[PDB]
Design a protein around this ligand. Structure first.
Ligand code: ALF
Ligand SMILES: [Mg+2]
Length: 1018
């Protein structure tokens, strides 16, 4: 059945072959069941850990590292029995870091909440259905309802499937459609067809939708769609068809990984070509026997040197620290990688009710009659302060405190509001927040009554439990409700009959009236001025109507609720209380006591957040299921739209949006800033159109309708008092219900992204330095200087501690005044690429020289020959007298610890001057980041431990160093800071206590004058 709302009830009955009270037969129900299925939303299967691990192992960098570990294990098998189990430490440690990365990634991306199964609890467990031929009413589970079936729904019942209403009992059907519109207001429904092929769910008032409870009233209806074909079915389908896409930083890192893999392949091929020169098959030797292990030892070392192993760990640590800061700001973050993507947000999409507003209806304006002029009257307008159901508020007439006891019209209005309401107010001691037991409008009237002590009741020390209803109880003690007249569609008003409790009261019959201004005023024939009744006149009616229209159609489109009372009601026994037609007849001689106006009020922290978003370059677009007028009024109130701003081509509705031209279809999302009366699919389409412009969108909401948009958007935020569907479909939850936390999170994400760029560049520079070192050692043929396990230790511990310290950098001063960054921004620029490539080349050359320094120019150590004996695998016993030295000195740990110490100290110095992108270290000292110096001294302490503890110098081929060699290492390492400062100065042009600290040290280390002898190849 398509467009069931357009067709009449007879047509939709005939199409299904269904009649009232004889809905279906035992075979027709089976045919409809097999044709469609079951009234159920298929759940999402939980993601198993095995598939998560397999997918996370698909990373190219991880794959290269795993291949390196495997080939290292193969090489270690060929190793002799002379060495101990330390030969297998390398594959073990590489596998350990790989599984550590996998486990930390699982911890990062594991969420127990499921987007469908736990969330779709809106489906009723049981519903009275199946008006088949067997009996009358069948209370069978809603799991197996067929589209042809007839359903009856009662008060508090949840609609099982998409139902096209046929008959309405109790004259009113109040439906709560918050899951599809976000509004808790009761939607009065009818059975008349709406003759439009394309209509939003709000326009469809002849249909019932699954998962929506009934505020009041009972009715009968015929199902139209079930299971996936329902509106909640569309919500679930949107919830499952959206797969989270890698954040822009992750895309940049994947591009870097692909580039790194290709350059690894090229460098490995080049090394293999060069290794042919040293080990040539025409030259008689064991080229295959022993040249293979040397080449593959390079390949494993090259792969280890290229991959920044500690980068995922430090990134996770930084994201976890940012998440902890957010949790200290009362905002719990569910996904760490989405913390940084907050900074690059181009557009913020928001839901009006609950997120921008308080979702607590409160009356803000009210007026009564004080003086009546000739064809004119004087309205005593008041304003109510308060946006919460708590009765803490004051009346303001021209912004002055007012005591309502003196005014008699206010007392009458308060009595009418107290008695003519069915709802009430209660206090939750557990939560500490007053909540509405019934309708929002009647609860707002109750709160207004309690705010002003019209009888001057004493509330000096009343408990919060009894403060909720004290004034209402005092009023109700005076007047008792004999009966009530229910709301009706035709009269659009509510009447309550009351009798005074005092036995000697002269007046004994009063009917209070509360309803829509039009009908109530047209049915009003007198005006209540103070305690005196006044005949009505045309001018007073016209001015009252004009005031109502300006209150309900301007900057603050409040819902208008006219009030009245009946001073001469007919006797109770004279009444015929069966039909609603007699109600309007009995409601004809009212006196206009006054009127009130109410709206959903925005929070007291939204407008500032919106203007701060505008300052930072983020556009805040409001998308809501409410009517366009209220949406625009709230937009103007919170500052999205100007008070006098024209919104002809900037505010749209879903029906307007769908029919719009494709070029204008793009243009609307390009320029418009407010969307109202939109389905959840419309919100998803808005977000998708915004993303099509390559813009990161932040969706904020608190309802089920927001969930498809929250999932579709890159980052989704949910309020801490909204539905669990929004909470679990969003990456961030605002526990304190504070909107400024969003701009705070954007600021923290920008700072986090800056720090992440800094330490990513630092780690990549270290890695390229190690790669250049390995390539130089392979090409020259010199004995190895850096072993892969030393590279693991350097890349993980002594780099992650400085990397975390660099992630602890203070943020930029102008961080929140800058526009959002382009998502396609390269992580490395050309000049910075040149800087870090030069640093890496210097690191490689320095490590190679430090290894060669011990071999050739050893001060106090064994001095080998020139670069002629650079090749060392050709050394053998009974050699042609190359030198009278042992051939086993080439494996000594002294050159290896030389290279390790040079690398570590150069990395420490690089961490010192990686504090800033282009600011020199002289301008801002390392003392600014007190974590940086602490992490660096901790890393030096760790290095000294691995040098001087008992077992550790065995795993790493290193030995303790004497003072002279340590000074040589320092002399080699120091010029890196000078080189970085020079490069920074060139970048810039194309404090004193810190400066005086290093002067006594630089002279002391450089005082010794030690020269070299390697000059022939130069
Ligand atoms: F609360 Al809404 F669209 F206004 F989900
Ligand atoms: Mg909402």
């Amino acid at each position: 059945m398509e467009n069931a709302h357009t067709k009449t009830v007879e047509e939709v009955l005939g199409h299904f072959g269904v009649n009232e009270s004889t809905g279906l037969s035992l075979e027709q129900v089976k045919k409809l069941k097999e044709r469609w299925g079951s009234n159920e939303l298929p759940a999402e299967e939980g993601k198993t850990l095995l598939e998560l691990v397999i997918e996370q192992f698909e990373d190219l960098l991880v794959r290269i590292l795993l291949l390196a570990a495997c080939i290292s294990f193969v090489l270690a098998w060929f190793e002799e029995g002379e060495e101990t189990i330390t030969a297998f430490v390398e594959p073990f440690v590489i596998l350990l870091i790989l599984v550590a990365n996998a486990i930390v990634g699982v911890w990062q991306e594991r969420n127990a909440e499921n987007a469908i199964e736990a969330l779709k609890e809106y489906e009723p467990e049981m519903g009275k259905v199946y008006r088949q031929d067997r009996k009358s009413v069948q209370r069978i589970k809603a799991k197996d309802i067929v589209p042809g079936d007839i359903v009856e729904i009662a008060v508090g019942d949840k609609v099982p499937a998409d139902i096209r209403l046929t008959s309405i009992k109790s004259t009113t059907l109040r439906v709560d459609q918050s899951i599809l519109t976000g509004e808790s207001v009761s939607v009065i429904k009818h059975t008349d067809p709406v003759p439009d092929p394309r209509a939003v769910n709000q326009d469809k008032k002849n249909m019932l939708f699954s998962g929506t409870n009934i505020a009041a009233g009972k009715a009968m209806g015929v199902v139209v769609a079930t299971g996936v074909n329902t509106e909640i079915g569309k919500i679930r389908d949107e919830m499952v068809a959206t797969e989270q896409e890698r954040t822009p930083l992750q895309q940049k890192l994947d591009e870097f990984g692909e580039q790194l893999s290709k350059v690894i392949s090229l460098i490995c091929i080049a090394v293999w070509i060069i290794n042919i020169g040293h080990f040539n098959d025409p030259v008689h030797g064991g080229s295959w026997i022993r040249g293979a292990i040397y080449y593959f030892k390079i390949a494993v070392a090259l792969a280890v040197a290229a991959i920044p192993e500690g980068l995922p760990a430090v990134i996770t640590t930084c994201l976890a620290l940012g998440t902890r800061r957010m949790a200290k700001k009362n905002a719990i973050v569910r996904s760490l990688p989405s913390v940084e993507t907050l900074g690059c947000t181009s557009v913020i999409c928001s839901d009006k009710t609950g997120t921008l507003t308080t979702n607590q209806m409160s009356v803000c304006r009210m007026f009564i009659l004080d003086r009546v002029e000739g064809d004119t009257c004087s309205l005593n307008e008041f304003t109510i302060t308060g946006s919460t159901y708590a009765p803490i508020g004051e009346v303001h007439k021209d912004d002055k405190p007012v005591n309502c006891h003196q005014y008699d019209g206010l007392v009458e209005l308060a009595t009418i509001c107290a008695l003519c309401n069915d709802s009430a107010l209660d206090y939750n001691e557990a939560k500490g927040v007053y909540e509405k037991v019934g309708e929002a409008t009647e609860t707002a009237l109750t709160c207004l009554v309690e705010k002003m002590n019209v009888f001057d009741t004493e509330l000096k020390g009343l408990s919060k439990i009894e403060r909720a209803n004290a004034c209402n109880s005092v009023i109700k003690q005076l007047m008792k409700k004999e009966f009530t007249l229910e709301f009706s569609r035709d009269r659009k008003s509510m009447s309550v009959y009351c009798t005074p409790n005092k036995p000697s009261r002269t007046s004994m019959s009063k009917m209070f009236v509360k309803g829509a201004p039009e009908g109530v005023i047209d049915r009003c024939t007198h005006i209540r001025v103070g305690s005196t009744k006044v005949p009505m006149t045309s001018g007073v009616k016209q001015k009252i109507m004009s005031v109502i229209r300006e209150w309900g159609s301007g900057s603050d489109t409040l819902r208008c609720l006219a009030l009245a009372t009946h001073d001469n009601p007919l006797r109770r026994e004279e009444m015929h209380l069966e039909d609603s037609a007699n109600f309007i007849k009995y409601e004809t001689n009212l006196t206009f006591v006054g009127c009130v106006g109410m709206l959903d009020p925005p929070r007291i922290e939204v407008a500032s957040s919106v203007k701060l978003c505008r300052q930072a370059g983020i556009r805040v677009i409001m998308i809501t299921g409410d009517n366009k007028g209220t949406a625009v009024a709230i937009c103007r109130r919170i500052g999205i739209f100007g008070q006098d701003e024209d919104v002809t081509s900037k505010a749209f509705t879903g029906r307007e949006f769908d029919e719009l031209n494709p070029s204008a279809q793009r243009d609307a999302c390009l320029n418009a800033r407010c969307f109202a009366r939109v389905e959840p699919s419309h919100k998803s389409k808005i977000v998708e159109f915004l993303q099509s412009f390559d813009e990161i969108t932040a969706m904020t909401g608190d309802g089920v309708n927001d969930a498809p948009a929250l999932k579709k958007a890159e980052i989704g935020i949910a309020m801490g008092s909204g539905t669990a569907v929004a909470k679990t479909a969003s990456e961030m939850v605002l526990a304190d219900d504070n909107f400024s936390t969003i701009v705070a999170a954007v600021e923290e994400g920008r700072a986090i992204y800056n720090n992440m760029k800094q330490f990513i560049r630092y780690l990549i520079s270290s890695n390229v330095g190690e790669v250049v070192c390995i390539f130089l050692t392979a090409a020259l043929g010199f004995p190895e200087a850096l072993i892969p396990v030393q590279l693991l230790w350097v890349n993980l511990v002594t780099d992650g501690l400085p990397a975390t310290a660099l992630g602890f950098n203070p943020p930029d001063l102008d961080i929140m005044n800058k526009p959002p960054r382009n998502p396609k921004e390269p992580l490395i620029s050309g000049w910075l690429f040149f800087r870090y490539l030069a640093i890496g080349c210097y690191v490689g050359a320095a490590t190679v020289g430090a290894a060669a320094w011990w071999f050739i120019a050893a001060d106090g150590g064994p001095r080998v020959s020139f670069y002629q004996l650079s090749h060392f695998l050709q050394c053998k016993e009974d050699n042609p007298d190359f030198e009278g030295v042992d051939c086993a000195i080439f494996e000594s740990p002294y050159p290896m610890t030389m290279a390790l110490s040079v690398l570590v100290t150069i990395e420490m110095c690089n961490a010192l001057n990686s504090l800033s992108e282009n600011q020199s270290l002289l301008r801002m000292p390392p003392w600014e980041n007190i974590w940086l110096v602490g992490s660096i001294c901790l890393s030096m302490s760790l290095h000294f431990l691995i040098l001087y503890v008992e077992p550790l110098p065995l795993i790493f081929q290193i030995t303790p160093l004497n003072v002279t060699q340590w000074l040589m290492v320092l002399k080699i390492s120091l010029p890196v800071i000078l080189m970085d400062e020079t490069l920074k100065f060139v970048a810039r042009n194309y404090s004193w206590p810190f400066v005086l600290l290093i002067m006594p040290l630089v002279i002391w280390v450089y005082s010794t004058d030690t020269n070299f002898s390697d000059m022939f190849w130069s």
